[PDB]
Amino acid sequence: AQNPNCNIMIFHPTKEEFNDFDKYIAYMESQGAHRAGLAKIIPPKEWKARETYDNISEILIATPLQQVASGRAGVFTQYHKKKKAMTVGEYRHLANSKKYQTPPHQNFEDLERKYWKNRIYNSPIYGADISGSLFDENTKQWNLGHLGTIQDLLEKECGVVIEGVNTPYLYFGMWKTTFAWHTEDMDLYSINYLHLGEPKTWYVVPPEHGQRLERLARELFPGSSRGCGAFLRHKVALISPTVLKENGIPFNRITQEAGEFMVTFPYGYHAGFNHGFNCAEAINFATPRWIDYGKMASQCSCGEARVTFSMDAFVRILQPERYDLWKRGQD
C-alpha cells in the first residue's frame, strides 16, 4: 500500500498535468495521498488565480464573527458572536491594528507555540463562508468556481438527478482565527486556495483513524457528547497537538502559504489557525470514491449543525433511513 504511514504529501504538477482536475486527484490517490487526510498542491509556476489583488477592498463581510473561547489552553470550545458589517478594507485595517496583529516571532514553530499558549485569552474576528470567488473567469485550470458539481457527480455515478448547487466560499482571516476539528459535510472532499496574505497552519487525522479522534472528543467534551451523537458537526471543538500526542491520536501538521492549494479527503478530520491577515477560497467536491463515505457519514440531528439546501438530496438519496428519521433537526 502507498503511503502506509499516512504522511501529508506535497505535489508539484506541471502545467500539462494541471489541465485535468479529476485526473490529477486520481493520480494523487494512486500515490496514497488520501491516507493522510490532507495534501498540498503547489501550482505550476506559469499559473495564476487572477492578475492582482489590488481591487478587493470593497467586498463586504456582512457578518464578521468574533471567535470567543471557553475552556483550557489545549482543550476548548469557541462560539461565534455576530458583529456589524465591514468591508474587506476595514477588516484588513482591523487585522493589522495593535489589538489584533500577529506578535513578533522567530519562525512558524515559535508562532505555533504562541497560538496554543495564548489563543483562549483573545477573541479574533473571522469572515466566514462568504459566498463568492476571486478566481478570474479566464483562469481555466483549478478554478474553484468552475469545478464539476457534486450533484452532477452523484448523477454520473448513481443515475439519479437531484436539486442543488455547489458554489465557493471566501474566508478572510486574521491572527488566531481558528477552524475547529471537523470533517466536511457528508464527508466530502474540500479544496482550499490561499489567495493572499499570511499563512494557515493545518492539523489532520488520517481517515482510517478518525474514530480515535471522535472517542477522545467524547471524553474531553462529555456534556457535548451527551447532547449529540455527532457533536463535532457543530464545528466548535479544539484540541491541541500536545493533547493529541498525550492521548496517542495519530495526526500530522503542515503550513499552507499564499499561492498554494490544500485538498482534504473524505473523513479526514482537520483543524487549524491563521497567522495574520489573509484570504482563502474553498469549496466541496466529490469523486467516485467519495460515494461510499457519503453513505456512511454521521449526522447531527440535535439541530445545532441546521446545513445547506443542497445537503438534503445527499442525505435523502444516500441515507434514506437517516433522512426518514430526521423528518419524523434542520426543521
Ligand X SMILES: O=C1Nc2ccc(Cl)cc2C1=O
Ligand Y SMILES: O=C(O)CNC(=O)C(=O)O
Stretch that binds Zn ion, among 193-201, 202-210, 257-265, 295-303 (CB under 5 A): 295-303
Residue 312 in the binding site for ligand X (CB under 6 A): yes
Question: Is position 200 annotated in a ligand binding site?
Answer: yes
What is the spatial distance between Cα 103 and Cα 98, in angstroms, rounded to a whole number?
9
Q: 59 or 323: whose CB is closer to ligand Y?
A: 59
228 binds, among ligand X, Zn ion, ligand Y, none (CB under 5 to 8 A by kind): Zn ion
Nearest to 172 by CA among 40, 58, 54, 281: 281
Residue 280 Cβ, how far from ligand X at the closest point, in Å? 25
What is the spatial distance between Cα 227 and Cα 106, in angstroms, rounded to a whole number?
42
Residue 190 Cβ, how far from Ni ion at the closest point, in Å? 5
Nearest to 267 by CA among 239, 244, 238, 295: 295
Residue 9 Cβ, how far from Zn ion at the closest point, in Å? 33
Helix (H) or strand (E) holding 271: strand 269-274
3-state secondary structure of 68: strand
Residue 201 in the binding site for ligand Y (CB under 6 A): no
Among 300, 313, 315, 318, binds Zn ion (CB under 5 A): 300
Supply 262's cell numbers.
490544500
What is the spatial distance between Cα 80 and Cα 64, in angstroms, rounded to a whole number?
9
Residue 133 in the binding site for ligand Y (CB under 6 A): no
As a whole number of angstroms, the longest Cα–Cα distance in the chain is 56
Residue 302 in the binding site for Zn ion (CB under 5 A): yes
CB contact at 8 A, 202 and 256: yes
What is the spatial distance between Cα 237 and Cα 255, in angstroms, rounded to a whole number?
20
171 binds, among ligand X, ligand Y, Zn ion, none (CB under 5 to 8 A by kind): ligand Y
Residue 321 Cβ, how far from ligand X at the closest point, in Å? 11
Among 24, 179, 221, 277, binds ligand Y (CB under 6 A): 179
Residues 200-239, one symbol each (x = binds Zn ion by CB under 5 A, - = not), give ----------------------------x-----------
What is the spatial distance between Cα 91 and Cα 238, in angstroms, rounded to a whole number?
25
Q: 257 or 323: whose CB is closer to ligand Y?
A: 257
**CA dist list (Å): 177 to 79, 80, 301:** 12, 11, 27
Residue 102 CA from chain centroid, whole number: 22
Contacts of 58 (CB under 8 A, 6+ apart): 87, 88, 89
Residue 280 in the binding site for ligand Y (CB under 6 A): yes
Question: Is position 235 annotated in a ligand binding site?
Answer: yes
The residues in 172-191 that bind Ni ion, with binding defined as CB under 5 A, are 190
Contacts of 331 (CB under 8 A, 6+ apart): 306
256 binds, among ligand Y, ligand X, Ni ion, none (CB under 5 to 8 A by kind): none
Supply 129's cell numbers.
463562508
Question: Is position 182 annotated in a ligand binding site?
Answer: yes
Residue 229 in the binding site for ligand X (CB under 6 A): no
Q: Which residue is nearest to ligand X (CB)?
A: 330
Q: What is the DSSP string of 193-206?
A: EEEEES-EEEEEE-
| Interface residue list for ligand X (CB under 6 A) | 299-301, 303, 305-307, 312, 315, 323, 326, 329-330
Please give the annotated binding residues for Zn(2+), written as ranges: 228, 234, 300, 302
Provide the annotated binding site for 2-oxoglutarate: 126, 192, 200, 235
The annotated binding site is made up of 126, 182, 184, 192, 200, 228, 234-235, 270, 300, 302
